[PDB]
Write a protein that binds this ligand. Structure first.
Ligand code: 83K
Length: 215
């Protein structure tokens, strides 16, 4: 695996979003992953709809939480692999109330065929990411509140409660790290990103890693 990867530098990552006062993290992570996979399968960078998942995926629980893997399953088994554009299906749960699933039509922005669950192993996730792109992961984000910058090295790592997107890593640094996209605006952390130390399962980063499959 390479020493360092940042998918943002290939132009593969969309702007940092704002989930607002809704517990839709799982959807931002899932959709983040799909946006990057669609881009890397050859299509142009498209912003996709989280609201689709929050309002329409009934295996998950909207503003009350969910799981990226359930979202990937819902997309494939209940929605024929289709993911709508953000433009046609925009986010409306910023105040913490999800609207009902829409009964209009929307523009399809991407299509997925499945997802893979990655091993529970930081090095193998890194290798898979170098080859195939950004990975949806669950983390314990209890200690993320106070984070302003740097590489977090004492992340409380007791219970998975948050979903985010790995976009890179650096194995060469003094303190190796993952580069993680969050959904709490660009005013949080490092322009909306966080670096956590790599190699010591910080925030339980390795426990629940996965990705949609395009094509
Ligand atoms: C997304 C995370 C989130 O929005 N967060 C935070 O983690 C921290 C935040 O702000 C500080 C925001 C809002 C927030 C969450 N807790 C608090 C407390 C106080 C202030 C602000 C906040 C959501 C959050 C769900 C939620 C919503 C309202 C209140 C509490 C929690 N997290 C998830 O959806 C999470 C993501 C997984 C780990 C990828 N999913 C779960 O926790 C589910 C919960 C079910 C679906 C209700 N649990 C599991 O998936 C779990 C495992 C991993 C299989 N189960 C099945 C045991």
């Amino acid at each position: 695996a390479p020493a360092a990867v940042d998918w943002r530098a290939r132009g593969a990552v969309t702007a940092v979003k704002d989930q607002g006062q809704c517990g839709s993290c799982w959807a931002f992570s899932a959709i983040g992953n799909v946006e990057c996979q669609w881009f890397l399968a050859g299509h142009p960078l498209t912003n996709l709809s989280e609201q689709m998942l929050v309002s329409c995926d009934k295996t998950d629980s909207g503003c009350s939480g969910g799981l990226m893997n359930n979202a990937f399953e819902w997309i494939v088994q209940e929605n024929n692999g289709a993911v709508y554009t953000e433009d046609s299906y925009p986010y409306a749960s910023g105040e913490g109330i999800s609207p009902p699933c829409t009964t209009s039509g929307h523009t399809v922005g991407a299509t997925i065929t499945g997802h893979v669950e990655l091993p529970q192993d930081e090095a193998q996730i890194a290798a898979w990411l170098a080859v195939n792109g950004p990975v949806a992961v669950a983390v314990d984000a209890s200690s993320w509140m106070t984070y302003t910058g740097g590489v977090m090295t004492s992340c409380v790592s007791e219970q998975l409660d948050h979903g985010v997107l790995l976009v890179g890593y650096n194995d060469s640094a003094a303190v190796p790290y993952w580069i993680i996209k969050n959904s709490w605006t660009t005013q949080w952390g490092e322009e909306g990103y966080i670096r956590i130390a790599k190699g010591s399962n910080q925030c339980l980063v390795k426990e629940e890693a996965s990705s949609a499959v395009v094509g």
